[PDB]
Amino acid sequence: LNRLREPLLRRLSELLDQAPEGRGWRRLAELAGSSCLDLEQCSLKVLEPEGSPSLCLLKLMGEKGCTVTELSDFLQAMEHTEVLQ
Amino acid sequence: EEDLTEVKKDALENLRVYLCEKIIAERHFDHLRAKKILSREDTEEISCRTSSRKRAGKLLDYLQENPKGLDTLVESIRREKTQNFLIQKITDEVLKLRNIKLEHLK
């Protein structure tokens, strides 16, 4: 999450931004179990020409202290295996 | 960049019908009048209208001359925190039209 380098996070964010899926980034922010300011500041971070909501959400979950295998478990729960590959 | 400008323009003007109902017309043009994008002549032209809705119409259509106006339209709504649920709606609209532009790039 917050520990890793620039290209992995950048590519994962710029791939998660282009989400034609109905289970998009707002779905990925809404996980199972574990207020408004997170969603509002990500949705205002998208207004810049070079931003993603995905970057804001990955920074948020890195501030959560999530780990890469933990997030991969959440992504398997997200049940789009195209993201995991 | 002007690509953001054009997608911002059509991303506003595609959705004129919904926004011209749930917006009080008078309660904003002191904030955006401080941004030096709107004048007293606009205030008199808006007050020339008699209907509720057409005020919102000509006011909403009187912002398509500068790209940065929509932010100010957010900002007063950000300022007076009475209603705020329109934000992620128009935001998701911008993400959608941005996605079509992005797929049209390659």
Author numbering:
A (entry chain F): 30 to 63, 70 to 120
B (entry chain H): 10 to 115
What did the original publication write about this model?
To provide structural information about the interaction of BCL10 with MALT1 we performed cryo-electron microscopy (cryo-EM) of the human BCL10 (full length)-MALT1 (T29-G722) complex. Visual inspection of cryo-EM images of the purified complex, underpinned by 2D classification and examination of the power spectra, revealed that BCL10-MALT1 assembles into flexible helical filaments of ~29 nm in diameter, with an ordered inner core of ~14 nm in diameter and a less defined periphery. Our analysis revealed that BCL10-MALT1 is a left-handed helix with a per subunit rotation of 100.8° and a rise of 5.083 Å, resulting in 3.571 subunits of BCL10-MALT1 per helical turn. This helical arrangement agrees with the one observed for the BCL10 (residue 1–115) filament alone, thus indicating that the overall arrangement of the BCL10 CARD core is largely unaltered within the BCL10-MALT1 complex structure. The 4.9 Å resolution map of the inner filament part enabled us to build a pseudo atomic model of BCL10 residues 10–115 and MALT1 residues (30–121) by flexible fitting of a BCL10 homology model and a related crystal structure of MALT1 DD into the EM density. Whereas type I and type II interactions are interstrand contacts between the helical turns, the type III interface exhibits interactions in the helical-strand direction. The MALT1 DD interacts with BCL10 at the rim of the CARD core filament in a 1:1 stoichiometry. A close-up view of the BCL10-MALT1 interaction site I (BM-I) illustrates that MALT1 binds to the C-terminal part (BCL10 helix α6) of the BCL10 CARD forming a new interface that is distinct from the BCL10 filament interfaces I–III. In BM-I, the two most central interacting residues of MALT1 are V81 and L82 situated in helix α4.
CARD11, B cell lymphoma 10 (BCL10) and mucosa-associated lymphoid tissue lymphoma translocation protein 1 (MALT1) assemble the CARD11-BCL10-MALT1 (CBM) complex that bridges TCR/BCR proximal signaling to the canonical IκB kinase (IKK)/NF-κB and JNK pathway in lymphocytes. Upon assembly, the CBM complex serves as a scaffolding platform that activates downstream signaling events via association of mediators such as ubiquitin ligases (e.g., TRAF6) and protein kinases (e.g., TAK1 and IKKβ). Beyond the scaffolding function, MALT1 is a paracaspase and contributes proteolytic activity to the CBM complex, which is key for optimal lymphocyte activation and differentiation. CARD11 acts as a molecular seed that upon binding induces the assembly of BCL10 filaments in vitro and in cells.
